[model samples]
Target: AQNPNCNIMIFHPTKEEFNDFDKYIAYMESQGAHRAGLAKIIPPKEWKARETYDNISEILIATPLQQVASGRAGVFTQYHKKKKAMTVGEYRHLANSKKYQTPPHQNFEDLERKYWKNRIYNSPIYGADISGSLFDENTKQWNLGHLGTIQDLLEKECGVVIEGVNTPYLYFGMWKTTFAWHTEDMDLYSINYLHLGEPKTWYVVPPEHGQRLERLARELFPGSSRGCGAFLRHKVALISPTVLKENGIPFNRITQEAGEFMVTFPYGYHAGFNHGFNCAEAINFATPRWIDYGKMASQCSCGEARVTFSMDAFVRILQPERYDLWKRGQD
Candidate 1:
C-alpha cells in the first residue's frame, strides 16, 4: 500500500534515435528500462497487416494441454500448461480460419469474442530460432544489433548454447489467450515488438511490489505443492488492474499499438492480453547488470526446478573462461 506512484512510460524513438543503437539502448536503460515501457520504433505502415497474420511463414502456435505433471510454478513463469507445438498455418487451417473470416450477420464484438474463445496460438516456446528468416530478414527489421553483443558474449563466455530459451521468439496473439504474469528468466530484460494487429494491453507491477503480490497470491490461492499460487495454473488466473488498484498495489497499464516495442525491466512482473489478433517478436537477454539477479534466479529454490540454462554455471565456470578467451581473442 505504501507503493510509489509509477506509470508505464512510453517513448517514440526518433528516426535518428533508432539509428544510434548505443544511444537508443542507453536511453531505454536511463529511463528505467528495468520498469515497463513501450517505445515506438516503426510506423504502422511498415508493419504487416492483420489480414496477413495467418500467413506469416514459419510461425508456431502453442496447443494447450488438458493436464500437466505435478509441480508448483512461480509468479513470473511460462509453460503453465503443456503445449503441443505446431505451425500457425496448420493451426489456422484446423481452426478453419473462421475466426479471421468476417461473418455475414455477426456483430464485430461478437466475432471478436468468439475469436478469443476459440483459438490456440502463442509466441514461440523454446527451440524455435527464426532470427535469420524473420527478425534479420530485412533491413527494416534490424534491431538485432541492439541485442547482438550481449547475446554473443553470454554464449561465448558461458560455452552453453541455450537455444530456445535465450534466443528471440515470435508471438501471434488473439483475444482471450493470455500470456501469464512473470518476470523474464532470472530477472533478465526482454523486448517485445508488436509488428502488427490490434493493440495489446499490458499490466505491470514493480519488482518490490511483485514480491508482495506473490506472497499475497500464496495466501489467496494455495494451489500448487510449492506455493506458486494463482499465477501458475494451466489456465492462469487473471489478476486484473482493478483488483491490484483496489488493493492499493501500484502498477502500470499500457495499450501497445502496431510498430511499438514493449521493454520489460529486470524482475518486473508484467502480463497482458492482445486487444485482438496481433503478431510480435521477443527475446530474453542478460546485460552485465543482470549477472547478480540471474545468479539468484538460477540458485533460488522458490520454484520447483530450473527451467532454462544454468545461470549459476554460466557465471561460475563459463564466464571466467570466457573472459580469458576474450583477452586472448580466442573464440
Candidate 2:
C-alpha cells in the first residue's frame, strides 16, 4: 500500500503516437507493460461495441453461456448457483424482448426499484476466431502475426490454452454486473478491451499488498480458508476503495470506456462493476521474464488452475533457444 512506484500505470497513445503501430508496440514493451502490469490503452479512435456485435449470432452460436443473478448476491461471488441458464440464442431473444424490458409492476416506484435491483447477464466467454491465420483450423499453425505480441509468443511456444489467443471472447453486462477482487491465474498478465457500452469502474491493488489483503480477508471472513482458490471464492466481502484507503491499502480507480484497453499485471488484485449494458473482449499473455513469478505462484493450492501456460514446460522446450538468457541469469 505504501509503495510509491508500484501503483497502477496508465498510458494514452494519441493518433500520431500510435499511427506507427511498431513504435507504439515497442514503447509498451520497453515500459515492461507485463511486469508492473496494470495499464490502460486508450486508442486515438473509438471502437464502437455495438458495431462489432451487430452480427452477434455469428459469434454466440458456438459458445455456451452462463447467467448470474446479480440481485441475490455479488456478481463475483462463487457461493450460489446461476439463477437462470440459457443458450446465446435464447439470451439474445430475452434481451431484445419488450416483455422483459417492460415488465409489469404494481407502480412506477416498484418498477424503478426492481429495475435497479436485479441486473443479470452472461459471464465472459471466448468468441470464434476472427483473425484469418492466427490459428489454423486444420493444421494448428497459430503463429503468423507481423508483430509478435507476448500473448502470441506464449500461445505459439508454450503449449498453453488461453482465451482470446486466436480470437477474443464476448462479455455481456448490465448494470451492476461485477467481477470480484481476484488476481490473474498464477499472477499472469491479462488484457481487457471494451468493444462498446457503458464504462466499467475498476479498483486495483498492487502486488506488494496482495498478501496483506489476503491476511485481512482471512481475518474478516473465515470461510476463505477452505482451499487455494478460496481467497478468491464467491460470496467474499466487497471491499470498496474507501475502505481500502481507511486500511492503508493502496489502490487505483479507473473507469474504462469503449475503445479503451486495460491490462492487469501479475498478482495485481482487481475488481469492478459495470455502469450499464455493455460488451467487452479480453485475453491472457505472458513473457519470458514472467517465469520466475509463475514458478513460485505455482506452488500454491490453486496453482494447477492458475498457471495455464506452464513455465517449466516452456523452459524445457525453449532451453536451447533461451540458453543465452538463462546463462546470463535472466529469464
Candidate 3:
C-alpha cells in the first residue's frame, strides 16, 4: 500500500488568495490540476477550527468490524447498518490507535481493537449537519458554505440545506476506517476538511481513468457489477493503490493533516482511510460546469439511492438568476 508514485495538487493559499474560494478552485482546475482528481488545501494559519456539536454528546452508529485478514488480498469492505447507538465519547475510548499500537506493533493492518461479539471495524460518524459554524469567526465570511462553485441553485427545493450537499456533514473517523472507492452523489465535486486530529490517507483516480477503474472493479467483483455497472458506489469494495498500480491505473496517495481541505473533481473516483482518530467534515458542491457531470450521473443512475437534489430544479434556478453564465451573448 506504500508505492505512492503520484502526486495530488496541494494548495496552501493565504486569506487573500482564498478570498474567492470558487475562483481559486477554478484557477486550480484550469491549470490542469483536475487531472489529479484531488487537491489538498492548507488553510492559512490562524484559521479557527470549529468545534462540532459537543463531541461527547453527539449520537451515531457504531459499525461492526471486518477483519482484514480474510479479505481479498487485504481488501475488505466492512459496512454495518446503523443499528447500534453510541456517542462519540464511547467510540473514542475504543478506537484509540496509539494505545493499541504501543499496545501491538503490527502494521496498522494486522492490529485490531479487541471487542465483544459485535466486533467493529471503522465506525464512520456521518450526518452531523454542520451549518451551525459555516462561517469563519476571524473573517466573518463563508467557510465553504456559499462558495459559488457549490452555490445552491435549487427551488422546487427553495433555499434549503441538504446535509451532504450544500450544507456539510461533520465526520468522526478512527484508524483503519475505510470509505470505499466511489465518486460524488451527483458527480458534483466534494470537499473534505480534517478539522483536527490525525492525518488521513487518500487514493484518487483521474477522470480520464474513471472508466478504466470501473472495468477493473467489474472484473474483481462480477456479482456486484453484473447488473449495476457502477458498483463502486455501493461502497462495499476497496482495493489498495498498489492494486491500482498493478493494473496500470494511475493514482495518488495523500497524507491529509489537520486543518487541511481535500477537493475531489467531478466523476473522478476516490477512496481512503484514516490513520488515527480524527474529526472531519465534507460536502458536495456544484458549478455551472458541473451540470454536465450531474446530467451524466442522473442518466446513468450510477450510484446507490436516488439523486437527493434535483438537477432540473438546479438548472431552473440557475437560468433565471445567472442567465449570463449559461447563455452566450446574454447579458
- On residues 85-178, what C-alpha lDDT tens digit does candidate 2 reach at each position? 4444554454445533334567534533443354343333212223222112332111123224554556565666444333334566544455
**Cα lDDT of model 2 overall?**
0.52
Cα deviation at 75, candidate 1, in Å, is: 13
What overall lDDT goes with each candidate model? 0.51, 0.52, 0.60
Local accuracy of candidate 1 as per-residue lDDT tens digits, 42-116 = 423443323344346456555533211122222222344456776656543433345532234355445434423
Report the lDDT tens digits of candidate 3 across residue range 196-217: 6766778898876788888888
For TM-score, the strongest prediction is 3
Residues forming the 10-long window of minimal summed lDDT in candidate 2: 134-143
Q: Can you give the TM-score per candidate against the true fold? A: 0.65, 0.62, 0.73
* Superposition TM-score, candidate 3 onto the true structure: 0.73
Q: Give the lDDT of residue 194 in candidate 3.
A: 79
Candidates in order: C-alpha RMSD to true structure: 8.1, 8.9, 8.3
lDDT of 1: 0.51
Candidate 2: how many backbone clashes?
Answer: 6
Report the candidate with higher TM-score, 1 versus 3.
3
